[PDB]
């Protein structure tokens, strides 16, 4: 499963947000590894929008237009147990719940991060 609970990350416009998603695999989890990150924007009604994906040993991005080029996995070895990603140059539009799904049949886990972006620094 994923090593961290549902959390809230508060950043400032322009900064970069690090969305942690580390996981441990069980001996039973013998199926192929899939890592999907979805987002439910606060500004609109869309829910569970695909942001980035790791399937069949390949990375697939370019799903959520407004987030183009600003999302990348942080680790250079996902299989090792780290699905974390970075959202660079945060904008107020990036506010919403980001979800990390890590699957290895029969294994499945997910984590929800509520990202908040503030015009200028301070959560004081």
PDB file of C-alpha atoms in Angstrom:
ATOM      1  CA  UNK A   1       0.000   0.000   0.000  1.00  0.00           C
ATOM      2  CA  UNK A   2       0.799   3.714   0.047  1.00  0.00           C
ATOM      3  CA  UNK A   3       2.935   4.904   2.976  1.00  0.00           C
ATOM      4  CA  UNK A   4       1.118   8.175   3.700  1.00  0.00           C
ATOM      5  CA  UNK A   5      -2.435   9.280   4.703  1.00  0.00           C
ATOM      6  CA  UNK A   6      -4.715  11.761   2.939  1.00  0.00           C
ATOM      7  CA  UNK A   7      -3.023  15.150   3.368  1.00  0.00           C
ATOM      8  CA  UNK A   8      -3.379  18.853   2.592  1.00  0.00           C
ATOM      9  CA  UNK A   9      -0.525  20.698   0.899  1.00  0.00           C
ATOM     10  CA  UNK A  10      -0.619  24.495   0.916  1.00  0.00           C
ATOM     11  CA  UNK A  11       1.695  26.328  -1.500  1.00  0.00           C
ATOM     12  CA  UNK A  12       2.009  29.745  -3.117  1.00  0.00           C
ATOM     13  CA  UNK A  13       1.438  30.688  -6.744  1.00  0.00           C
ATOM     14  CA  UNK A  14       4.535  30.092  -8.829  1.00  0.00           C
ATOM     15  CA  UNK A  15       6.098  27.632  -6.397  1.00  0.00           C
ATOM     16  CA  UNK A  16       6.398  23.916  -7.097  1.00  0.00           C
ATOM     17  CA  UNK A  17       4.339  21.342  -5.224  1.00  0.00           C
ATOM     18  CA  UNK A  18       5.716  17.937  -4.306  1.00  0.00           C
ATOM     19  CA  UNK A  19       2.906  15.384  -4.077  1.00  0.00           C
ATOM     20  CA  UNK A  20       4.323  12.357  -2.221  1.00  0.00           C
ATOM     21  CA  UNK A  21       3.062   8.885  -3.030  1.00  0.00           C
ATOM     22  CA  UNK A  22       5.362   6.097  -1.848  1.00  0.00           C
ATOM     23  CA  UNK A  23       4.170   2.499  -1.720  1.00  0.00           C
ATOM     24  CA  UNK A  24       5.219  -0.949  -0.606  1.00  0.00           C
ATOM     25  CA  UNK A  25       4.487  -4.085  -2.615  1.00  0.00           C
ATOM     26  CA  UNK A  26       3.277  -7.427  -1.272  1.00  0.00           C
ATOM     27  CA  UNK A  27       4.528 -10.826  -2.495  1.00  0.00           C
ATOM     28  CA  UNK A  28       0.995 -11.507  -3.721  1.00  0.00           C
ATOM     29  CA  UNK A  29       0.936  -8.421  -5.940  1.00  0.00           C
ATOM     30  CA  UNK A  30       2.179 -10.323  -8.982  1.00  0.00           C
ATOM     31  CA  UNK A  31       0.211  -8.443 -11.605  1.00  0.00           C
ATOM     32  CA  UNK A  32       1.657  -5.617 -13.775  1.00  0.00           C
ATOM     33  CA  UNK A  33       2.236  -2.252 -12.084  1.00  0.00           C
ATOM     34  CA  UNK A  34      -0.037   0.701 -12.855  1.00  0.00           C
ATOM     35  CA  UNK A  35       0.286   4.169 -11.464  1.00  0.00           C
ATOM     36  CA  UNK A  36      -2.400   6.723 -12.224  1.00  0.00           C
ATOM     37  CA  UNK A  37      -2.801  10.245 -10.893  1.00  0.00           C
ATOM     38  CA  UNK A  38      -6.191  11.913 -11.226  1.00  0.00           C
ATOM     39  CA  UNK A  39      -7.474  15.350 -10.318  1.00  0.00           C
ATOM     40  CA  UNK A  40     -10.766  16.953  -9.386  1.00  0.00           C
ATOM     41  CA  UNK A  41     -10.282  20.688 -10.034  1.00  0.00           C
ATOM     42  CA  UNK A  42     -11.899  23.092  -7.630  1.00  0.00           C
ATOM     43  CA  UNK A  43     -12.635  25.684 -10.320  1.00  0.00           C
ATOM     44  CA  UNK A  44     -14.795  23.396 -12.480  1.00  0.00           C
ATOM     45  CA  UNK A  45     -17.073  20.378 -12.158  1.00  0.00           C
ATOM     46  CA  UNK A  46     -14.828  17.712 -13.672  1.00  0.00           C
ATOM     47  CA  UNK A  47     -13.846  14.893 -11.325  1.00  0.00           C
ATOM     48  CA  UNK A  48     -11.209  12.159 -11.476  1.00  0.00           C
ATOM     49  CA  UNK A  49      -9.394  13.637 -14.492  1.00  0.00           C
ATOM     50  CA  UNK A  50      -6.357  11.652 -15.643  1.00  0.00           C
ATOM     51  CA  UNK A  51      -3.181  13.704 -15.162  1.00  0.00           C
ATOM     52  CA  UNK A  52      -0.266  11.339 -15.664  1.00  0.00           C
ATOM     53  CA  UNK A  53       0.082   7.588 -16.027  1.00  0.00           C
ATOM     54  CA  UNK A  54       2.651   4.810 -15.690  1.00  0.00           C
ATOM     55  CA  UNK A  55       1.464   1.699 -17.538  1.00  0.00           C
ATOM     56  CA  UNK A  56       3.340  -1.087 -19.270  1.00  0.00           C
ATOM     57  CA  UNK A  57       6.671   0.313 -18.101  1.00  0.00           C
ATOM     58  CA  UNK A  58       5.983   3.631 -19.833  1.00  0.00           C
ATOM     59  CA  UNK A  59       5.004   7.122 -18.757  1.00  0.00           C
ATOM     60  CA  UNK A  60       1.995   8.787 -20.345  1.00  0.00           C
ATOM     61  CA  UNK A  61       1.268  12.440 -19.780  1.00  0.00           C
ATOM     62  CA  UNK A  62      -0.569  15.095 -21.733  1.00  0.00           C
ATOM     63  CA  UNK A  63      -4.055  14.156 -20.489  1.00  0.00           C
ATOM     64  CA  UNK A  64      -5.023  17.260 -18.561  1.00  0.00           C
ATOM     65  CA  UNK A  65      -4.310  20.228 -20.907  1.00  0.00           C
ATOM     66  CA  UNK A  66      -4.192  22.963 -18.249  1.00  0.00           C
ATOM     67  CA  UNK A  67      -1.443  21.055 -16.482  1.00  0.00           C
ATOM     68  CA  UNK A  68       0.671  20.376 -19.568  1.00  0.00           C
ATOM     69  CA  UNK A  69       4.420  20.178 -19.029  1.00  0.00           C
ATOM     70  CA  UNK A  70       4.133  20.991 -15.328  1.00  0.00           C
ATOM     71  CA  UNK A  71       3.758  17.413 -14.039  1.00  0.00           C
ATOM     72  CA  UNK A  72       6.465  14.764 -13.738  1.00  0.00           C
ATOM     73  CA  UNK A  73       7.190  11.813 -11.476  1.00  0.00           C
ATOM     74  CA  UNK A  74       9.875  12.809  -9.005  1.00  0.00           C
ATOM     75  CA  UNK A  75      11.578   9.408  -8.749  1.00  0.00           C
ATOM     76  CA  UNK A  76      13.710   7.941 -11.526  1.00  0.00           C
ATOM     77  CA  UNK A  77      12.668   4.456 -10.431  1.00  0.00           C
ATOM     78  CA  UNK A  78       8.915   4.172  -9.829  1.00  0.00           C
ATOM     79  CA  UNK A  79       8.963   0.395  -9.467  1.00  0.00           C
ATOM     80  CA  UNK A  80      11.151   0.860  -6.393  1.00  0.00           C
ATOM     81  CA  UNK A  81       8.076   2.195  -4.623  1.00  0.00           C
ATOM     82  CA  UNK A  82       7.795   5.915  -5.315  1.00  0.00           C
ATOM     83  CA  UNK A  83       4.981   7.343  -7.434  1.00  0.00           C
ATOM     84  CA  UNK A  84       5.463  10.922  -6.208  1.00  0.00           C
ATOM     85  CA  UNK A  85       5.057  13.773  -8.690  1.00  0.00           C
ATOM     86  CA  UNK A  86       5.803  17.493  -8.901  1.00  0.00           C
ATOM     87  CA  UNK A  87       3.468  20.188 -10.144  1.00  0.00           C
ATOM     88  CA  UNK A  88       5.657  23.090 -11.206  1.00  0.00           C
ATOM     89  CA  UNK A  89       4.782  26.793 -11.316  1.00  0.00           C
ATOM     90  CA  UNK A  90       1.513  26.363  -9.411  1.00  0.00           C
ATOM     91  CA  UNK A  91      -1.450  28.489 -10.470  1.00  0.00           C
ATOM     92  CA  UNK A  92      -4.717  29.133  -8.660  1.00  0.00           C
ATOM     93  CA  UNK A  93      -6.340  26.838 -11.230  1.00  0.00           C
ATOM     94  CA  UNK A  94      -4.326  23.909  -9.864  1.00  0.00           C
ATOM     95  CA  UNK A  95      -6.368  23.855  -6.664  1.00  0.00           C
ATOM     96  CA  UNK A  96      -8.264  20.627  -6.120  1.00  0.00           C
ATOM     97  CA  UNK A  97      -7.966  17.073  -4.909  1.00  0.00           C
ATOM     98  CA  UNK A  98      -5.170  15.054  -6.490  1.00  0.00           C
ATOM     99  CA  UNK A  99      -5.370  11.296  -6.183  1.00  0.00           C
ATOM    100  CA  UNK A 100      -2.596   8.728  -6.453  1.00  0.00           C
ATOM    101  CA  UNK A 101      -3.588   5.165  -7.438  1.00  0.00           C
ATOM    102  CA  UNK A 102      -0.949   2.421  -7.198  1.00  0.00           C
ATOM    103  CA  UNK A 103      -2.010  -1.014  -8.468  1.00  0.00           C
ATOM    104  CA  UNK A 104      -0.323  -4.444  -8.619  1.00  0.00           C
ATOM    105  CA  UNK A 105      -3.097  -7.061  -8.884  1.00  0.00           C
ATOM    106  CA  UNK A 106      -4.543  -8.149  -6.532  1.00  0.00           C
ATOM    107  CA  UNK A 107      -3.032  -5.146  -4.783  1.00  0.00           C
ATOM    108  CA  UNK A 108      -4.522  -1.676  -4.938  1.00  0.00           C
ATOM    109  CA  UNK A 109      -3.986   1.545  -3.012  1.00  0.00           C
ATOM    110  CA  UNK A 110      -4.797   5.223  -3.354  1.00  0.00           C
ATOM    111  CA  UNK A 111      -4.046   8.480  -1.582  1.00  0.00           C
ATOM    112  CA  UNK A 112      -5.775  11.833  -1.789  1.00  0.00           C
ATOM    113  CA  UNK A 113      -3.971  15.132  -1.538  1.00  0.00           C
ATOM    114  CA  UNK A 114      -5.851  18.370  -1.210  1.00  0.00           C
ATOM    115  CA  UNK A 115      -3.633  20.989  -2.829  1.00  0.00           C
ATOM    116  CA  UNK A 116      -4.249  24.653  -2.037  1.00  0.00           C
ATOM    117  CA  UNK A 117      -2.567  27.496  -3.919  1.00  0.00           C
ATOM    118  CA  UNK A 118      -2.401  31.008  -2.480  1.00  0.00           C
ATOM    119  CA  UNK A 119      -1.783  34.194  -4.501  1.00  0.00           C
ATOM    120  CA  UNK A 120       1.116  35.131  -2.266  1.00  0.00           C
ATOM    121  CA  UNK A 121       2.907  33.194   0.494  1.00  0.00           C
ATOM    122  CA  UNK A 122       1.294  32.643   3.920  1.00  0.00           C
ATOM    123  CA  UNK A 123      -0.595  29.943   5.786  1.00  0.00           C
ATOM    124  CA  UNK A 124       1.534  31.822   8.300  1.00  0.00           C
TER     125      UNK A 124
END
